[PDB]
Ligand binder design. Structure first.
Ligand SMILES: *[C@@H]1O[C@H](CO[C@@H]2O[C@@H](C)[C@@H](O)[C@@H](O)[C@@H]2O)[C@@H](O[C@@H]2O[C@H](CO)[C@@H](O[C@@H]3O[C@H](CO)[C@@H](O)[C@H](O)[C@@H]3O)[C@H](O)[C@H]2NC(C)=O)[C@H](O)[C@H]1NC(C)=O
Ligand SMILES: *[C@@H]1O[C@H](CO[C@@H]2O[C@@H](C)[C@@H](O)[C@@H](O)[C@@H]2O)[C@@H](O[C@@H]2O[C@H](CO)[C@@H](O)[C@H](O)[C@H]2NC(C)=O)[C@H](O)[C@H]1NC(C)=O
Ligand SMILES: *[C@@H]1O[C@H](CO[C@@H]2O[C@@H](C)[C@@H](O)[C@@H](O)[C@@H]2O)[C@@H](O[C@@H]2O[C@H](CO)[C@@H](O)[C@H](O)[C@H]2NC(C)=O)[C@H](O)[C@H]1NC(C)=O
Ligand SMILES: C[C@H](N[C@@H](CCc1ccccc1)C(=O)O)C(=O)N1[C@H](C(=O)O)C[C@H]2CCCC[C@@H]21
Ligand SMILES: C[C@H](N[C@@H](CCc1ccccc1)C(=O)O)C(=O)N1[C@H](C(=O)O)C[C@H]2CCCC[C@@H]21
Ligand SMILES: *[C@@H]1O[C@H](CO)[C@@H](O[C@@H]2O[C@H](CO)[C@@H](O)[C@H](O)[C@H]2NC(C)=O)[C@H](O)[C@H]1NC(C)=O
Ligand SMILES: *[C@@H]1O[C@H](CO[C@@H]2O[C@@H](C)[C@@H](O)[C@@H](O)[C@@H]2O)[C@@H](O)[C@H](O)[C@H]1NC(C)=O
Ligand SMILES: [Ca+2]
Ligand SMILES: [Ca+2]
Ligand SMILES: [Ca+2]
Ligand SMILES: [Cl-]
Ligand SMILES: [Cl-]
Ligand SMILES: [Zn+2]
Ligand SMILES: [Zn+2]
Lengths: 604, 603
């Protein structure tokens, strides 16, 4: 480690710790920058040379984290907890968690190589007969094809191509991660990930939320299953069994917005999927980011700086180059460079994803002047919820009208049910998946799910929560969890479940602050500088204060609460219940063993 | 209740509590007697009258615990914790746990009635094609038929006939039981059941034990699956998938000794299943119990008293009267009456069941002069292990020879493998099932497994631990867990897993104390008065002391330990590994979704 980057001496006391943290910050920005830079270079241009570079950068970071980690231990191990300065106890608390830097060098190199090989396998996998990529080709098939055999080929192809080769690496990664975090005092890596919510009752709290939300999901599921039955027939849809996992518009069945056209309650009201209009009008990626931005400035939040426009990758490269297409928002930790990397497609759901990603950037712009260790959301779920909250306003028929995407206006009970159903396809359908992913991963980290049951336990959870089944037989040579980006890329998931609850609490609060007094689901906070100021206080706080207190200042309550979500959706919750009873549906999937047959001429 | 049964007044201090506890136990014997008495009259004679009587007694019993529980909290709720006398602290801890008695009266009724209907449904269910009962007909089919289609009909018949009508009742029971135990401070009934082991780390401890044992089970499974493939063929056995749940000798696939004849590793040697010889020689139920008894008296433990021989039901009644055939051992809490109720069949596995049950009685005889509250095992696993320990000695080829059931065996490597394999079929195969039943039930009690997932979670666990699959499609109308006796009869199961480890610890201790020095698996403690004396000390102690301390005095360690089991089985564990490698077996069942097809014209 360069001399300039190494820790000096500090007193063993709180005044030393303050100088320590200032010295650290000087040197940490340079180290975070080189690492983020090498990551960007690789992810926007996957080559062996760029992967070698990212590996060395990652090793440099570990070296740093180890020297500054062991020094912070040596000097403040038994005294940091008693520091008067709360921001300082959290900075110190971060620095002395070494993570992967606890590993000896050989294992550190093995760890860094595993992350790089898993990322590469996921982001370069293809399905062939001439080969389809995930983004855009398979994405578009899952979204728009309504042919059982085509969707299946895409589903199976992807899960096989991405999952099967990840499995040996994922096992090795899991052992090393655990070894690393056990030397910071955690039983396993999952315990460390959960520690970020600083709540003793986290798992119980999540479970109590899910119990309130589950009836919504059960009713949506049944109603969608019925619409699937009418299209696909009795051979492929069991009205008392799980839904085949390739029919819901998305590779993971995680959001069902793309089958909206098959399930829309009242088809001669306004068409609320404005994708056709966007194409018809000639929208491109950069227009989508510009329109997101202008929402932010309408609140008196910050525009995207020049560095963002010059550096970002907003379209899939046409010049050959392999890239990681999975959308992401990047802080370079130099207070100057912030970028998005997205293989943006011109669709309504991508407009929402553009807002999601820009919400990440906006957080990074607002907390850029905190110490590096406090440059995070009050919890991870808060960072995931910012962009989603604005997208709630953008999605409204009134807002869409204002931005020229929805010529007709209507305010009647049918249009409202259409809108809430569309939104339930996006938000309610995701809840089970949001919850289950890290239940899977927590079991893997703890050792409850060994390699020999990775796929068995995955599908147990998928059926248990989402009420889906795999459309072809799977066995333990398959590694279907590995066909979802966040598993190989080691990104936690429970943030998204937290986010899907939190965003409705935020929405309700920002709507009331804006002076809005109509139904919660028709609120649009566009141009509300009051709403703006309230959101700004959250974004500026970073992780400098407990998330419970930041939440309480924002929404007046110190806990996750499903009530705002339930309220937003109440009309469609009631409507779906009534429809399902009148149709005589079975709620749930009591034929839990059922799987559909193979199509007759498959795949030939 | 009667006034003479309702509590006195007592000072709020340790001296009061000593008198209190004495006054409690005097009155509780009378109350336990009439309860157990009515239960007996019902189980050997299922009618509505007998059910009504049992219900009354249960109500009376709740009334008792109510009053005595109220009084114990009222008098000592703060202070009992700081009593010097540990034995007293345990008695008072128990008294203020009210259970079902926390229930309001109407729900007391309701709970008492669902038990009766669930018991009845299980024990009177039949399979018709002239109708087959579980015991003996379906038991015998599962044991000895080698026709895929007959076994299937029996398996599906039973699961459907018993399971399906239990489900609505089981749901109501579960809610009532949870409500009861929440008022004593347990999150749920499962947490109460588990409190019996007085161990913060119980669940972790069980899991750590299962991890050491699991390789043994995996090697046995693969070896047996291979044997079944040779027999049934590739259509019905997947060499990389779970074994169809009807093929292993038992309705629940829980122990596999009855397919021994199909898997025996060196077949030409003497037949270590002495069933043929027992029938040839004209053995009957009575003889089986008399031979068991005499093993106990060889140790200078107690003979069965006259009241046991006069009162017991040791055969299935031929008047036809509905009975609960499931074998059980009965303490009447009067220090006089002790009985077994068993529909005894003349087989070698029943001879072990006879010893198992007689182990319960021996316990009850040895602690009959204790305060009722100490009249249980040091933990429930202790009680389940006693008769099993003696049965391990009885099952040895040398012991069998001594009681005229087998010609002398050659003491060579092959006869040893044969024997250890038979014993693995009985003991190792049981381990997963022993562990999973209460995993299922704890999930139901905690709310993790709602009615809408009773069968899904059941089969998850079955496949996860036993590596079996249902041979016909099941859905949530089926309630396959209800087709196992202990579920409708609300009897915990984890005691059997604990027992199956404990028994090997005991066996090693008793063998060392007998002065035996050969292999663990060839020991016979028959006629060792020293071994007998050591077991007597355990049995006399009841639950007067922490099971950890009782165990330490007996065996040297203060915890459950798989090492004695591993050592008993070492030779066959090594052999099974080698067989499996040479056949190129896959250990486990990676084709986890696999289920067999239906046979051609079924039914
Ligand atoms: C779409 O339509 C709803 C319904 O509007 C109401 O019912 C219709 C059937 C007609 O009778 C309308 O005249 C009638 O307003 C609109 O929601 C309603 O908006 C108004 C405010 O804009 C709400 O009233 C306010 O109530 C607050 C206190 O809550 C008072 O302080 C205010 O003075 C004010 O009167 C009204 O409660 C609300 N109704 C519901 C069910 O929430 C909605 O605004 C309209 N939406 C769009 C997008 O135009
Ligand atoms: C596990 O499955 C693989 C993949 O086979 C496919 O998935 C199976 C679960 C089942 O649906 C099969 O019909 C599918 O072919 C099995 O390996 C393949 O086996 C096929 C056919 O048996 C064979 O032709 C291929 O070479 C194998 N590979 C591929 C690319 O399909 C595997 O044997 C199953 N069991 C185990 C333990 O992995
Ligand atoms: C049976 O023979 C063993 C010795 O032979 C070995 O172990 C057998 C179990 C069998 O598997 C053979 O093929 C083996 O070659 C006797 O064991 C010894 O006994 C003495 C006396 O206690 C003891 O000191 C030794 O340690 C024992 N050795 C072993 C192998 O543990 C065993 O006692 C014999 N018993 C009978 C029934 O004849
Ligand atoms: C597109 C989005 N991408 C993620 C990218 C996260 C990431 C972390 C670290 C290194 C690299 C990438 C994000 O921006 O949070 C995403 O994966 N998801 C999740 C998904 O698509 O699975 C859940 C989605 C909820 C709605 C908004 C988009 C959310
Ligand atoms: C036959 C035996 N019957 C049980 C009877 C239990 C019982 C408790 C309360 C009221 C009524 C019955 C017993 O003696 O533990 C039994 O069920 N099993 C269990 C079973 O057969 O499922 C597990 C067996 C392990 C070896 C010994 C026999 C064990
Ligand atoms: C992708 O990254 C590669 C590194 O693998 C970049 O390669 C450098 O590019 C130019 C010519 O292509 C040379 O001057 C360098 O010496 C290259 N290095 C190697 C190892 O070839 C490449 O330019 C990148 N592509 C883009 C468009 O950024
Ligand atoms: C549950 O299953 C019942 C019995 O048959 C089983 O399922 C049918 C569909 C066949 O596949 C058969 O081989 C199985 O053992 C059905 O009658 C019943 O409708 C099923 N569904 C429900 C909701 O109970
Ligand atoms: Ca779409
Ligand atoms: Ca989508
Ligand atoms: Ca048997
Ligand atoms: Cl997270
Ligand atoms: Cl128990
Ligand atoms: Zn995000
Ligand atoms: Zn027993």
């Amino acid at each position: 480690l360069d001399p300039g980057l190494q820790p000096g001496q500090f007193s063993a006391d709180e005044a030393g710790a303050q100088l320590f943290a200032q010295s650290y910050q000087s040197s940490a920005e340079q180290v975070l920058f080189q690492s983020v830079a090498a990551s960007w270079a690789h992810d926007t241009n996957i080559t062996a040379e760029n992967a070698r570079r990212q590996e060395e950068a990652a090793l440099l970071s570990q070296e740093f984290a180890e020297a500054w980690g062991q020094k912070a231990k040596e000097l403040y191990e038994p005294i940091w907890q008693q520091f008067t300065d709360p921001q300082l106890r959290r900075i110190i608390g971060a620095v002395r968690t070494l993570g992967s830097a606890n590993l000896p060098l050989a294992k550190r190199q093995q760890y860094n190589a595993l992350l790089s090989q898993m990322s590469r396998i996921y982001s370069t996998a293809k399905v062939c007969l001439t080969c389809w990529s995930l983004d855009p080709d398979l994405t578009n098939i899952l979204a728009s094809s309504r042919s059982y055999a085509m969707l299946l080929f895409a589903w199976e192809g992807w899960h096989n191509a991405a999952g099967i080769p990840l499995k040996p690496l994922y096992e090795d990664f899991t052992a090393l991660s655990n070894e690393a975090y056990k030397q910071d005092g955690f039983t396993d890596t999952g315990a460390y990930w959960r520690s970020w919510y600083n709540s003793p009752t986290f798992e119980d709290d999540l479970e109590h939320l899910y119990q309130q939300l589950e009836p919504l999901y059960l009713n949506l599921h049944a109603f969608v299953r019925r619409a699937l039955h009418r299209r696909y027939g009795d051979r492929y849809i069991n009205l008392r069994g799980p839904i085949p996992a390739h029919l819901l518009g998305d590779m993971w069945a995680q959001s069902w917005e793309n089958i909206y056209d098959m399930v829309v309650p009242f088809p001669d009201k306004p068409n609320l999927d404005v994708t056709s209009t966007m194409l018809q009008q000639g929208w491109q990626a950069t227009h989508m980011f510009r329109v997101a931005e202008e929402f932010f400035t309408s609140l008196e939040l910050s525009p995207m700086p020049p560095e963002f426009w010059e550096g970002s990758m907003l379209e899939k490269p046409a010049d050959g180059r392999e890239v990681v297409c999975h959308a992401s928002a990047w802080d370079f930790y130099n207070r100057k460079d912030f970028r998005i990397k997205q293989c943006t497609r011109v669709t309504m759901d991508q407009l929402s994803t553009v807002h999601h990603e820009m919400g990440h950037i906006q957080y990074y712009l607002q907390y850029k002047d905190l110490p590096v260790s406090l440059r995070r959301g009050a919890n991870p779920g808060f960072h995931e919820a910012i962009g989603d909250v604005l997208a709630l306003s953008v999605s409204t028929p009134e807002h869409l009208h204002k931005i020229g995407l929805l010529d007709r206006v209507t305010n009647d009970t049918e249009s409202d049910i259409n809108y809430l159903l569309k939104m339930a396809l996006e938000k309610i359908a995701f809840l089970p998946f949001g919850y289950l992913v890290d239940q899977w991963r927590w079991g893997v980290f703890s050792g409850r799910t060994p390699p020999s049951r990775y796929n068995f336990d995955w599908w147990y959870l998928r059926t248990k929560y989402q009420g889906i089944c795999p459309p072809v037989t799977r066995n333990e040579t398959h590694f279907d969890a590995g066909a979802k980006f966040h598993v190989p890329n080691v990104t936690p998931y429970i943030r998204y479940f937290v986010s899907f609850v939190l965003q409705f609490q935020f929405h309700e609060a920002l709507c009331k602050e804006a002076g809005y007094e109509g139904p919660l689901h028709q609120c649009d906070i566009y141009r509300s500088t009051k709403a703006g100021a309230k959101l700004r206080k959250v974004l500026r706080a970073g992780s400098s204060r407990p998330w419970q207190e930041v939440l309480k200042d924002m929404v007046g309550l110190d806990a996750l609460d499903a009530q705002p979500l339930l309220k937003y959706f109440q009309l469609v919750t009631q409507w779906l219940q009534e429809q399902n009873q009148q149709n005589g549906e079975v709620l749930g999937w009591p034929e839990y063993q059922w799987h559909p047959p193979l199509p007759d001429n498959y795949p030939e």
